[PDB]
Design a binder for this molecule. Structure first.
Ligand SMILES: O=C(O)Cc1c[nH]c2ccccc12
Ligand SMILES: O=C(O)Cc1c[nH]c2ccccc12
Lengths: 502, 502
């Protein structure tokens, strides 16, 4: 296997569990916003620059696959160019430059170090250890190349807003370029590259432990700070702003990884098909990383589009977790024989039902302890979420004799079909308010008002799959992929119930 | 070699370099006191409990040397008992219980996790990997055993101060005992021990990455928070309080490690002399760890003796660094043949001259940029510190041909003897204000007012040592040990100049 895909769910649990820890700490006022800045300044000014310096000094530039960098970088430049040109065409005259600066940086700049690296490490540390290098190459080179352009557009806006001024272009270009130079990521990569040549790849033995201590502290500390900064950030956006945010998160989490995968396949004219495939799959995985928290920091510094950029960075972080898991497994399935593939979809189902059961217990606990379950539409919703919890427990049981199998099936498919029933009954309440057994097998199938609208929309968008999937077993490539998307939905429907009511 | 003693200086540079980073960040107001609490709450409530749980679940209790635990624990109980009984006898009636509570906890509770573990790891990870277990065993079991007694004395004081009350003993005992149970170290060790039995030693694969991320972030993050909390903490103490602080830091950093070493040699009646010697040396290294930052937190919570305890914890942290380095090398020398031992003292000299040169550059930079060097006694002091910087550079050169050797000697010993000259001339200003070459060898020898009083008081110790050393080589065990203490002084005299004027 090219990806150690089994290691991805443990790594996602590290990543988004530590982000959830920081979010819980901020929500519980264990760490207030003014206290969080100590972790943020530790992370950004000490742990991250030490991690960057360490890895840049160690880096074997004579063994880097430059065509991977070129590919991801051209893919990011493509999404940057598309989002920028399109924004200048679509946006209102008084704010087209603040948007044309921050929207392209949003759509291209990844959460490479905090979230990307634990995931790339998990997937590729053993199978393709060279892939861990390109986190430290891509992320800064792409800030260096793309961010000054977006900063230049924000400086143009700052100039334009300052209507009493009429000054010349070179201060605009210089000030935006100076802004990327002042980023620790950029200057520590220049410094680390310099010391890579000076020291060879060898960190001095007496400095090594110090850089290890700071660098190794970045991962958890940065994920936790990301959690803290996500508290109270999703402000209720206008309809247009929410559409723009959806477009930009789609640019980052769908268009960019598709273009990354395509660019690798265009430019990586090396021979080995497995190396080419794993590099293509890594390019996709790279594109799926959420928006860098630094973009929200730039937006705060300029005082421009900060609502959309912060909300979008938070939502991108959350939305990346399932997209990353789903994408990586989906890219691994082409390499798997049908028996390991059936195993794999049950592993996927177990993983999603773990997170969904946790999310459902929390959602139910809120709706029950708040006693909201007696009001409308919460009266129906709590039925749906109990039924979803029974679904997830059914899968965690099914992951671990013949009589138990038949019993656990009826638990799972009475509650599953019931969750579809409640999905429809719940949607309707918003409108009013306004074949044979097959025991010798591993898979199981073949035997408030506005927020509630969003839940029923997403759940109905999910519903397609287990409809088709069972009449089609009564096949081929798209069946095992939609078997996966209906398993994802069967067990992960509660995660959407949670993401909206938690 | 029982200790990988060469790894200790890199580890100390990690430990006290990251502490110095946090101190620099707090001094520069990169992180204000109110911002530092975010790092503190991350460290104490997430990264430390995850580290504890991880290591306690992994722990092979069927392979622990219980006699080491018994030894360190009885040594700590001995120092606790001595400091407690002696404090109740010596202290003034109105505060004898707050002191009898916090002074014994001070004298016994070590900075085990932030500072102790990187050092034990460095020294013993390869040679005696089992020694890393006892950090996680000793530290909580000693909180559990000794801290409730000291808390009980602080509760007795709180009761006594609350003169309108006359309540019964069982609330006092229960409330102090509840205070140790509420400590994350204690409850996560109970929880981790429980899950060690439940899970065997095997952390669940999907929880493992999460615990790794949080736990691995503790080391650097806790050292940095320790640095932040050390900013502005050494308040100018009374003469009596400074003597008491010196006695308590001597209890922690001298009496406790001596008793730990003795207790191991009393109780470790196993056979192998090298295992016995390395365990004895580890027991000493364990006793040398500075005071736990938690003691200052207890003192803040009780609002008792907080000045002495905080100052003492900061000074203990700083004083531990040289004592730890000096002690570990000194304990390694008995195992070394005279040629590796001569090598070793030059390695020691290089290490101390690195830190001292850094410290001297900073000290000089302050005295020069402040232009204090024109006032008294700074006029002489800046001469001393230039001469000390030339000494340290002389050693770093001597660590890396025959003509260069003769040149670098005269640099080193003109400046060394001159630093002794200025040591005397400087002390006097305070009172007024109020043999043959031997080129075939590796060692070099054988060819404000109140703060200034403290500086000159300690360089007297040093004038002493190098005196004896050369006239005697013009031998035996105490000579190679004092050869080391005069090398320590020759090159580390600038570090004392820095610790007082920086
Ligand atoms: O986007 C990144 O991965 C870099 C980064 C810079 N400052 C951060 C704070 C928290 C989490 C990640 C980062
Ligand atoms: O004393 C220890 O090593 C434990 C510890 C608990 N809270 C701390 C904060 C900073 C550094 C260390 C600790």
């Amino acid at each position: 296997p090219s990806m150690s895909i089994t290691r991805l769910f443990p790594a996602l649990l590290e990543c988004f569990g530590i982000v959830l820890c920081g979010y819980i700490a901020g929500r519980a006022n264990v760490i207030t916003s003014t206290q969080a800045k100590g972790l943020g300044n530790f992370v950004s000014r000490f742990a991250l620059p030490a991690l960057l310096f360490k890895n840049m000094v160690v880096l074997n530039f004579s063994n880097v696959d430059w065509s991977f960098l070129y590919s991801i970088l051209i893919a990011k430049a493509s999404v940057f160019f598309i989002v920028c040109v399109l924004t200048l065409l679509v946006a209102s005259p008084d704010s087209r430059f603040s948007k044309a600066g921050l929207f392209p940086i949003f759509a291209t700049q990844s959460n490479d170090f905090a979230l990307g690296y634990p995931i790339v490490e998990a997937l590729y540390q053993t199978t393709y250890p060279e892939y861990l290098q390109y986190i430290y190459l891509v992320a800064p080179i792409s800030l260096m190349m793309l961010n000054p352009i977006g900063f230049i557009f924000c400086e143009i806006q700052k100039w334009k807003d300052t209507q009493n001024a009429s000054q010349n272009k070179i201060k605009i270009v210089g000030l935006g370029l100076l802004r990327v130079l002042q980023n620790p990521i950029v200057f520590m990569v220049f410094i680390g590259i310099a010391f890579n040549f000076i020291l060879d790849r060898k960190v001095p033995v007496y400095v090594e432990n110090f850089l290890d201590g700071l660098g190794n502290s970045f991962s958890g500390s940065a994920l936790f700070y990301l959690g803290l900064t996500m508290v109270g950030k999703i402000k209720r956006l206008k309809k247009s702003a929410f559409v723009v945010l959806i477009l930009l998160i789609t640019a980052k989490l769908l268009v960019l990884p598709l273009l990354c995968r395509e660019m690798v396949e265009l430019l990586d004219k090396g021979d080995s098909v497995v190396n080419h495939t794993s590099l293509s799959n890594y390019a996709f995985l790279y594109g799926v990383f959420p928006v860098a928290p630094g973009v929200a920091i730039f937006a705060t510094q300029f005082n421009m589009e900060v609502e959309i950029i912060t909300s979008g960075m938070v939502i991108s972080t959350f939305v990346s977790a399932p997209i990353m898991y789903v994408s990586a497994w989906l890219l691994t399935f082409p390499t798997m024989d049908p028996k390991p593939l059936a195993y794999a979809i049950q592993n996927v189902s177990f993983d999603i039902s773990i997170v969904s059961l946790i999310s459902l217990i929390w959602s139910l606990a809120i709706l029950l302890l708040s006693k909201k379950y007696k009001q409308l539409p919460h009266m129906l919703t709590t039925n749906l979420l109990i039924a979803q919890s029974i679904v997830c427990a059914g899968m965690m049981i099914w992951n671990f004799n013949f009589v138990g199998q038949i019993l656990v099936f009826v638990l799972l498919y009475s509650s599953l079909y019931s969750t579809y029933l409640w999905t429809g009954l719940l949607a309707i309440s918003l409108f009013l308010l306004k074949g044979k057994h097959n025991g010798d097998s591993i898979d199981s199938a073949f035997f408030q008002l506005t927020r509630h609208v969003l839940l029923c929309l997403l759940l109905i968008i999910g519903l397609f799959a287990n409809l088709s999937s069972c009449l089609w077993w009564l096949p081929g490539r798209l069946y095992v992929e939609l078997q996966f998307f209906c398993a994802v939905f069967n067990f992960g429907q509660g995660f959407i119930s949670f993401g909206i009511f938690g």
